[PDB]
């Protein structure tokens, strides 16, 4: 689609950076950005990245199963819901998850305003 | 204020109505509303309700396993992500589903602007 392609473009970029070094994701978040990771609530790039960095695993790889997006308003922002697998420490057994991002335009890219993450037992 | 309690109340109302009589979910949607039901994309209360009513089951029950909510902006709107089990008809084994709602404050209540729904398979 368009919003699915627009959302996918950014999401792939986001996960590519997450999988190579999640400590460098700061630029994709802003001061008012919020992260709710398995109920843990963080606000701001600093605290959000700290949380992601703190996650207990060396290597991680995201495998996307489904991705659905819609314009979050008439003005340019996008809402995307993703379900996929998290492969950690080079382990074959996947850890399924569901995630939602509220993306705000910034130049030809976006930054994350809302990030909601949940493990989703398989 | 309490967007967590707001989400609990709205989602409970929504799924209760969906499980009771989905043909009456119309007033929770508006003309601009968008529903992505798996591969189906609909806009407007009429088409959205039509799609939900077309689902060929006689009985359905939503069982929430996770619920998260964050303010979608500084102006009152809310983002809600839900994951849970969907029991269709007399099927014993439930299906996993994930859903995100972007709720807009309609004066003194809310309506769904964004509705993204997906069944998740292992």
């Amino acid at each position: 689609l368009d919003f699915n392609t627009l959302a996918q473009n950014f999401t792939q970029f986001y996960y590519n950076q997450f999988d190579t070094d999640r400590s460098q994701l700061g630029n994709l978040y802003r001061n008012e950005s919020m992260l709710t990771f398995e109920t843990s609530q963080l606000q701001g790039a600093k605290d959000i990245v700290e949380k992601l960095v703190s996650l207990p695993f060396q290597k991680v790889q995201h495998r996307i199963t489904t991705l659905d997006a819609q314009p979050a308003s008439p003005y340019g922002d996008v809402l995307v819901m993703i379900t996929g697998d998290l492969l950690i420490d080079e382990e074959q057994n996947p850890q399924r998850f569901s995630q939602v991002f509220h993306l705000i335009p910034d130049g030809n890219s976006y930054y994350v305003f809302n990030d909601i993450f949940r493990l989703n037992y398989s | 204020l309490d967007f967590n309690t707001l989400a609990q109340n709205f989602t409970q109302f929504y799924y209760n109505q969906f499980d009771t009589d989905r043909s009456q979910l119309g007033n929770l949607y508006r003309n601009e509303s968008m529903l992505t039901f798996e591969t189906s994309q609909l806009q407007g209360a009429k088409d959205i309700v039509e799609k939900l009513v077309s689902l060929p089951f006689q009985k359905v029950q939503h069982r929430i396993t996770t619920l998260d909510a964050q303010p979608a902006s500084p102006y009152g709107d809310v983002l809600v992500m839900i994951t849970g089990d969907l029991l269709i008809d007399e099927e014993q084994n439930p299906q996993r589903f994930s859903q995100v709602f972007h709720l807009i404050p309609d004066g003194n209540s809310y309506y769904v602007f964004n509705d993204i729904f997906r069944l998740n398979y292992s």
Partner: peptide
């Protein structure tokens, strides 16, 4: 504990 200014 999510605020805006």
């Amino acid at each position: 504990g999510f605020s805006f200014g």
